[PDB]
């Protein structure tokens, strides 16, 4: 059901949110990462994000809780609704296009260590119509 590689990739996502590396995601850490990803959620919006996943109730998300939600979302969310949500993270100004500059910001934000050239290559590979940027449909074709 879950290989070690899938588990470590789910840990890579968990680690981004648990910035102090103590095995727990707090609101403060959830708030910090969500703001770096363009968003700006409400203080209530952060405690019920934490809440919907914190299954034992200690007010915090450990990796077993996280791995349980990710395994369920992987089985429940449809493949198209999946990417739409990711696109909206990339398309930081909501104009319907992911530019190289927008992709660069997410790459640096998620601690990736890519060259400006490599990001350009990433855009090149998904750009199907040649306008130098990535729309929603182009994103789904690469992501699947």
């Amino acid at each position: 059901q879950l290989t070690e590689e899938q588990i470590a990739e789910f840990k890579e996502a968990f680690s981004l949110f648990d910035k102090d590396g103590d095995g727990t995601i707090t609101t403060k850490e959830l708030g910090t990462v969500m703001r770096s990803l363009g968003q700006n959620p409400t203080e209530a919006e952060l405690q019920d994000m934490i809440n919907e996943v914190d299954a034992d109730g200690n007010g915090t998300i450990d990796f077993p809780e996280f791995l349980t939600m990710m395994a369920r979302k992987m089985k429940d969310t449809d493949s198209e609704e999946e990417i739409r949500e990711a696109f909206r993270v990339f398309d930081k100004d909501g104009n319907g296009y992911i530019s190289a500059a927008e992709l660069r910001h997410v790459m640096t934000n998620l601690g990736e260590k890519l060259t400006d050239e490599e990001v350009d290559e990433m855009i090149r590979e998904a750009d199907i119509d040649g306008d130098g940027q990535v729309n929603y449909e182009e994103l789904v074709q690469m992501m699947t």
Binding site: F17, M34, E85, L114, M142
Partner: peptide, 19 residues
């Protein structure tokens, strides 16, 4: 939600790096 979208994005970067 926002947790799974983040996984999807890190996978996109992963897939590219293998090329």
């Amino acid at each position: 939600g926002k947790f799974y979208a983040t996984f999807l994005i890190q996978e996109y970067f992963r897939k590219f790096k293998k090329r």
